Ligand binder design. Structure first.
Ligand SMILES: Nc1ncnc2c1ncn2[C@@H]1O[C@H](COP(=O)(O)OP(=O)(O)NP(=O)(O)O)[C@@H](O)[C@H]1O
Ligand SMILES: Nc1ncnc2c1ncn2[C@@H]1O[C@H](COP(=O)(O)OP(=O)(O)NP(=O)(O)O)[C@@H](O)[C@H]1O
Ligand SMILES: [Mg+2]
Ligand SMILES: [Mg+2]
Lengths: 246, 239
RNA sequence: GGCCGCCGCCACCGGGGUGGUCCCCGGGCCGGACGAUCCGGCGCGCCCCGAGUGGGGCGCGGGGUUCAAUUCCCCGCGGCGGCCGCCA
RNA sequence: GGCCGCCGCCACCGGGGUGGUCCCCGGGCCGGACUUCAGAUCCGGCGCGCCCCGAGUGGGGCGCGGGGUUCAAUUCCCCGCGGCGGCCGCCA
């Protein structure tokens, strides 16, 4: 069906650009997609202020969440922390939708250069620190491993990428658990095991004979799971008797 | 406090531009303000589709709503219908905040000119019809009356506008027994008048009789409906 | 990136049990005796034996307890995860 | 923009009620009743208009937009004037 696309990468690596191109392709593919990012709101404020961020984070997540109920969502954001990427995944987990992390990278070189061409709104010094404190996706959690790693300096086959994503959208997202396909059959197993250990201690057996006692139980148990009705007490005696006449 | 500023005007009249300016000024005035408009989300879609509108509307209102809890909010939208403007007011009504409608005007001429300059993404034909069906703010409801009417063709004193708004933000947003005796006695009198067909002079007395009785009772502290109503009926029968 | 938790380190995969030199359930695969069925088996390393096919022995991160450790204790490696680090 | 509607025209202001000649509740003011002052108390009252009497100061008549159902209209109905709203129309 539809899925959540999480982007991750340092400022200026080309995330927003990426989003719009990827978004157009996906459209041509008859896929309703929307690009959401914290900036949408953050930049709706004439000025920036630390106190705004709480609201911004909350407002952004709400959009993604409500948007993910009906459309493909490409999250255009830094997500330089893994716990952020997690938060975004829990949204897809919540609506049981497939999710794909796309990590865009580029050498600090290209980043500093592009930031200078932007007026250096964000001090080069910051860009440098972020590059260092950035959480390499996949390095800590397997759920964090990137479905793709894109190098914005080289070409990009948006058609191939769109193809791969669509195919993953069709897969089954197993976020938590499943079952595929008793007590008495089990109690006989456990008990016979203890009985065999008792017999082995009372006869001070050697390696050779013990292996027969073990095979003796194996044969015994096989003969029993063939019989329909069985009683713990009864069987356990037939076993002890079998061991005594060994 | 903080208030909800509603913008209204045809596409290209200068709404978004207006918002950014008004927001900057309000900022220097130590006021936390945010600019929100349906376009924010609509344009987050690579292409446009009728079915997106529902989400776009709902998602936008949610933002304005959650934003108006902590910040001033300038709604940058066309809102060419009054029912739309109302729906935004209901938000301010909900949080009991002041609201100010700002109508941006411009001759069809300036609009068509500006639309051409934008690539005419919106066919001129459309701009023309929207102009012909733009609900003139105030024309139907007093609550719709514009706090201001701005002509984007002439200059704009953002400092003056900012001052007026601030001042309006400070204004205040607006948004038994004795009775039962009166009612019943009235009924009793109508009943008595039906069962005896009195004369003009006579009924005038019955009415003055109730008048005097009622006055005598509003003097007594404790009273019981059932009880007094009986004393009245008895007084009626003994006259 | 910091803190902490669960698990694996018995050897086809998954799940589970267990002081027995492993075992049970499901799946897969291989071989032998007879075509389905019956029976046996399954990884890596090292060593011995056989002209060869093949057969057999030893071991399974380090150490402790024990007749015996996959299991129980301490340590080491690894797998997975949780919380938080939040325009940067 | 389309469709539907509410309130006032009882009379200090606002809300409301009720076929009883009006009233109920809150506000404001004026005055009477207990003051040097001030938070308070109970109680009478409060608008508009046309005509007349004060040979002086005040009081008297009647009406409360037009008509109808009525013994009685503030109330119920039709219209007028005055004030206000609801739903919907939705990139456009
Ligand atoms: N594939 C690309 N190759 C070269 N330059 C690119 C590419 N994509 C984007 N750019 C340019 O790199 C600069 C930043 O791109 P942008 O998409 O804004 O990055 P971003 O990560 O979204 N930035 P930010 O939102 O601040 O984190 C602009 O000059 C883009 O035009
Ligand atoms: N005060 C102004 N005087 C003259 N031109 C203006 C003014 N304000 C804005 N413009 C120009 O008018 C064009 C559109 O302005 P814009 O602010 O986008 O209007 P809008 O109503 O927000 N448009 P839309 O979002 O499509 O409804 C741009 O060229 C603006 O620069
Ligand atoms: Mg960006
Ligand atoms: Mg605009």
């Amino acid at each position: 069906h539809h899925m959540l696309i999480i982007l991750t990468g340092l400022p200026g690596v080309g995330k927003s650009t990426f989003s719009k191109n990827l978004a157009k392709i996906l459209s041509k593919n008859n896929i309703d997609v929307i690009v959401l990012g914290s900036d949408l709101i953050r930049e709706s404020f004439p000025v920036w202020k630390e106190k705004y961020e709480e609201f911004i984070k909350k407002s952004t997540y709400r959009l993604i969440d409500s948007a993910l109920k009906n459309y493909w969502v490409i999250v255009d954001d830094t997500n330089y922390y893994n716990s952020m990427r997690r938060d975004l995944i829990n949204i897809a987990k919540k609506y049981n939708k497939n999710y794909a992390i796309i990590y865009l990278k580029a050498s600090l070189d290209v980043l500093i250069r592009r930031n200078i061409e932007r007026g250096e709104k964000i001090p080069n010094e910051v860009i440098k620190k972020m590059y260092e404190k950035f959480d390499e996706p996949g390095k800590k959690y397997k759920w964090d491993e990137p479905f793709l790693i894109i190098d914005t300096t080289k070409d990009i086959d948006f058609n191939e990428i769109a193809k791969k994503l669509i195919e993953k959208s069709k897969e089954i997202p197993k976020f938590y658990v499943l079952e595929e396909n008793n007590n008495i059959s089990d109690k006989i197993d456990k008990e016979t095991r203890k009985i065999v250990s008792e017999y082995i201690k009372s006869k001070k057996l050697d390696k050779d004979k013990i292996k027969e006692v073990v095979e003796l139980r194996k044969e015994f148990l096989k003969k029993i799971k063939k019989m329909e009705e069985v009683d713990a007490d009864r069987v356990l005696k037939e076993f002890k008797d079998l061991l005594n006449s060994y």
